[PDB]
Amino acid sequence: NLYFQGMWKSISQVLAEQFGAYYFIKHKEKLYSGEMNEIWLINDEVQTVFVKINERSYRSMFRAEADQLALLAKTNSINVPLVYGIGNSQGHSFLLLEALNKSKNKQSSFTIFAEKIAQLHQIQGPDKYGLDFDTWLGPIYQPNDWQTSWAKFFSENRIGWQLQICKEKGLIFGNIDLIVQIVADTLSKHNPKPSILHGNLWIENCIQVDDKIFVCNPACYWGDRECDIAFSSLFEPFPTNFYQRYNEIYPLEEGYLERKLIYQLYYLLNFSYRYYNKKQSYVSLTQKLINQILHK
Template structure:
């Protein structure tokens, strides 16, 4: 496997990449992660079984698309590859620092500029992605309420049910979400899709973000997730609003968008989020 990684990096850098050091960072929910170094260029490596190559390709494509927008900072992609028994994703190694309110304020402006970009008249994406370790379908839809209720809330409810977590009448919940969003037809924005503190870091005095789950959707989905657990700094929201003011009715939709992430967490980490998710669903159905 390491020979295959060296070869991909040699193609990327134009010279053979001799791995001098390998440091296992941790084994996360899905992938093993490593930091390797040839003495010149450190590289962050994600490793999994061969069957995960499509997931790594999707992640690489998402990071490339975000990079091409010239708005938010993301790690460079060095390549995706496969060996006899593994697949891997090679990324820029980020020297992470401690974040500050000033840095988050600049990030707020960058995110607003991302959300302002034009690029689609429909909601979805031309390929499917993953939210964490969970497959995320992105079929194109003209109607936002249909897209979000079916491909976000309905999809996660079904996954929960298949794993033995029953939040009630799935069709009723989908219909309720559709009804509450029915009059809301926002401009399709390219959203990060997985934007919370765990997926942001300060690098060389700039905020970088990673592990995206992009699609063209309502920008409020990104903002809602930033507020769910540990809200970003007030400077982030103030600077975001200075570029792209939030709709006055955002708070009416915020918990609906947050429910998507709670459903996802409920079947990924069932011991921690089920009760909170039930509370959100009870409030939705009132």
């Protein structure tokens, strides 16, 4: 595997610049992933590194992921893994992160996490929705061109965008314009304070590390804080104390339950696209949810 050897050399080089001394790789282990990316753990007998790998052209995505972890770390709110760097080789690109030690879950760690998620959403920034660069949610990038209207931004850059991607794979749920317009009507009078979103907030991206929860795989943008909350309760939800404490610090506004459905629809379309060949319950839930929004 000639190109694979070049890849390890480039990783050693990026790690050398980072730590100051050259990084001699002594052990390497490939972890399982359903995802597009290959995942590895490597170490030099002292420092362990978590490595995401893909083809060379994915360097831009890995760059975006690193910039998100950086901007999230700078808010001094949620716990995110450190970035050691990005890079590429002849046939691969990669992201290099802190290897977090996963310990047994503590329900109480979610009370503190809700305080950090709250703090994150309370940060005042721009008066428009989006971000300076396009972020990714699974294998699809999210258009983040700035918009003053949330109705428009979510309707087209989220729902419409994902519906089109699904259509290309043959996942057809209904007339796309109709769905976009219905979602736009619901958000018609809703232009909330833009909040910096983790963007991929659900249980599988949380990791218990000693007494704190860390969160990974961001899909950031400035949007409605409710999208984060909505997604976290879609599948296996966070425990009860999270929602209790979050609502106590930053009370959710009137209209939340109606909006929760269209916010959740975005993730189901994404999941449907990513896993139609494997799970199959994602399509069924998406179709049922679309019928509710469209018929009733």
